[PDB]
Design a protein around this ligand. Sequence first.
Ligand code: FMN
Ligand code: FMN
Lengths: 376, 374
Amino acid sequence: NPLFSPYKMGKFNLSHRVVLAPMTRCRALNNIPQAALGEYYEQRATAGGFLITEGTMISPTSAGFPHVPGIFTKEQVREWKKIVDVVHAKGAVIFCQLWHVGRASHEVYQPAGAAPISSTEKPISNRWRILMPDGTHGIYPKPRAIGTYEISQVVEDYRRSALNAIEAGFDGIEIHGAHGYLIDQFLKDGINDRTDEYGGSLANRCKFITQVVQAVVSAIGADRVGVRVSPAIDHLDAMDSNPLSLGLAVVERLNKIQLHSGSKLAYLHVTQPRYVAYGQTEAGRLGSEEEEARLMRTLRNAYQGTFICSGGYTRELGIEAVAQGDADLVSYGRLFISNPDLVMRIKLNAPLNKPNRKTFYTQDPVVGYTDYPFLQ
Amino acid sequence: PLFSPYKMGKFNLSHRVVLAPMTRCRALNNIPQAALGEYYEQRATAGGFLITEGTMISPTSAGFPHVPGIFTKEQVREWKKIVDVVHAKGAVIFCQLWHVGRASHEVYQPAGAAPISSTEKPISNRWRILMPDGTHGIYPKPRAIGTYEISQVVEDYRRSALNAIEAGFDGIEIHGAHGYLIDQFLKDGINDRTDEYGGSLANRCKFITQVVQAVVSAIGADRVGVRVSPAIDHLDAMDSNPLSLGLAVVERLNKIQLHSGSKLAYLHVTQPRYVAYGQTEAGRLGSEEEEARLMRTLRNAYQGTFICSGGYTRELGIEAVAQGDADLVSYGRLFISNPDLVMRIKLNAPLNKPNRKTFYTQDPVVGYTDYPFL
Ligand SMILES: Cc1cc2nc3c(=O)[nH]c(=O)nc-3n(C[C@H](O)[C@H](O)[C@H](O)COP(=O)(O)O)c2cc1C
Ligand SMILES: Cc1cc2nc3c(=O)[nH]c(=O)nc-3n(C[C@H](O)[C@H](O)[C@H](O)COP(=O)(O)O)c2cc1C
C-alpha cells in the first residue's frame, strides 16, 4: 500500500501519506478556538501524520461562515496553542490554513455591517447561497473593489497571521487560494475585471497570490508554507477561460518564488473537480475522469516540489495516485469528518462511517463533530 | 398510498408503481426479441403501467447497441407480440420514442454521417459512449441541422408514433430528457443557434412543441406522454435557469392540451438529485430545497398527471404521493433486479440488489430476467 510508504516533506518525516484536508466546521464559537477543536484534531492525529486545520480568519473582515476560528488576535493564539500541543503529543504535523473569503461574505459577518472586499464590484450570482448564522441561506451582496494600498494591508494580515501561527506552535501555514475566495477572485478571469496592475494578463492576475506567498515566505520561511489552489473548480462563479493555463502560470510563480528564496515551499495543494456519476441516467456511469487526471498530473509535473491532491479521493484513488506518481500526498475531507481513525481504516481497508452533512456546520461541540465512532 | 388507485385518462391504474423506461440492449440488431417479452411480462401487473426502453425513431437515432426500433414494419411485428403478452397480464404499456442527437457515435450511424443536433458543439470527453464491443468510445462532432431538416425529424416522431399504435401500444412517451436530441434544443448550454429555434426561451421550446403537437395530431393527446429533465447533469445538458425553462415547457403543453381539447397522458419529470460540489465549502447549500421547489413548482403548473423518477425508494415514493408531489412514481434500478417490485413494495419485502455489470449486456437471461421473485 503506497499510501503507507514514508514521505519526506521537507524536514518532516511523515509515516504515511493520508492527510486531513482543511475543513470549515463552525465550532470555534465567536471566532475563538474551543476545546472541542482540540478533541476533534486529537481524534484524527496519528504518529507521523499530517493535518491541516479548518480555514482560519486573518482579519476581522475575512469571514463568510459563522464561528470560524481566527488567528489574528493574541487570545486566539493562546487557544490555538493548546490544540497544537495535544496534536504534537500524538506525533502529528499540523499546518494552519489562512483563509480570506473576499466577496463570499455577508454584512452579518462584516464589522459595522460593511461590504465584503474583493478584486471586483461584481457579486456572486444567486445560483450560490451563503450560510447565515441562524442556519438559513442568504444572498451574497455586492462587494467593494480594493486598491493597491488596501491590497498591501491584506497581504500584511496574511503575514501577521502567519507569524501568529508560528507563535502558537504550528509547524507551518497553508494559503487558501482556492474555491473562489479572495485570492481566487484575483486569479480567475471570470471574476477579475480589473484594469490596473492586478488584472488582465495572467501575470497581473497572479500578482496578488505572489505577493501573499512572498510575504509569508519572507516572514517564516518557505519550508513552513503550503499553497492551495483550484484552477478548474468554479465554486461561487470562479471560472477561468483556460484553467490549465492559469494553473500553469500559478505554478510558474511558485517555482520562481522558490528559486529566488533559495528554498522550496512545503507543498502545492490542488483540489480537482470531481463529477459524481449518475447511476439513474443512461450513460452516467460510462464517463471517464481522464481529462481532469491529465490536468492534475500536468500541474504536478510542472511544480518543483511536494504535491498534495484532493477532491473526491477514496482509498483506491489515493493508492492509485501515489502509485502512479500523480501525487506525493492525498488529503481527505468528508471521509475524515465521519472517520476519526480514517488512516487506520485505510490501512486495514475497513468499512467507513457515512458523513452526515446536516451537522457539517452546526455549533455543537460533540454532535456530528467528535461522536463519530472509532473501529471496534 | 402507492396502492391507492389512480385514473390516468381512460386507464384505471391499481397502483402508483411505474416501470421506468430503461435501455437494456437485448433487442439484438435493433429488432425486439422474445427476451423483451419475458422481461416485461415478469414485471407487468394487473392495472400496472409500464414504459419500454427508449426506441429508435429512425436509422440515425441510436447511440447505444442492440436498442429496439419502431421505424420498420419488422420491428412493429415483433413489438406486437410483446404488447399482447403485457396486455394479457392486464398492464398498460407505452413505447418511449428516443432520438439521441449528438449523443451518438458512428458505429451507430448508417452512412457514417455526423450525429444531428441543435449545435456543432460536441459532448465533452468526460462522457463516453458504449461501443458494440463493450468498450467506451468518444463522442464525435455533431452537425447542426437547419430549419428544413427540423421538420423531417418531427416527421420521424410522427411516423414512429403511428407505428407504435399499429403495434398495439396504449401510447407513446416523448423522450425529451437527459441531454438527448430534444433536450439539446431546450438547454441554453447546448442550443447556441441564431435562427427561430435558438436564443429566447420561446425559441428553444419550439422544437419540443412541434414534436408533441405532431404526435398529438397523429394519435391523439390521450396516448402521448412527455418526459423532460430541466435540471439534469447528463451529457453536458445545463440550462442557466432550469425553473424558467420547465415552466415554459409546461405552458406550451398546457396550451397544446387547450387547443387539442384533450389532456396529455402525463408529464414525466426526472429529478436532479444534486450531488455536485460536495467537496466544496458552500456548493451544497440550498441544493436540496431548490430541487424540491423545482419539482413541485412544475407539478402545480402542469394541468394533468405528473410522474416523478430517479433514485426513488419505497419510502420516498410513499412520501411523494402522500404529500401530493406526484400522481405516479416510476422506478428504474430496483425494477431491474426485482421483477415483482410491485408485489415487494406492497409487502415491504427485501429487494434484490441490481448488478450494474449486466445492465447493458446482450444475454437474454443473465442479468436480465434471472432475478428471482419473492
Ligand atoms: C464541510 C467542508 C468544509 C470544507 N472547508 C474547507 C476549507 O475551509 N478550506 C479549504 O481549502 N477547503 C475546504 N473544504 C474542501 C476540502 O478541504 C477538500 O478539498 C475536500 O473535502 C476533498 O474532497 P473529499 O471530501 O471527497 O475528500 C471543505 C470541504 C467540506 C466538505
Ligand atoms: C440502466 C438504465 C437504463 C436507462 N434507460 C433509459 C432510457 O432508455 N430512457 C429514459 O428515458 N430513461 C432511462 N433510464 C432512466 C430511468 O428511466 C429512470 O429515470 C431512473 O432509472 C430511475 O432511477 P432509479 O433507477 O434509481 O429508480 C435508464 C436508467 C438506467 C439505470
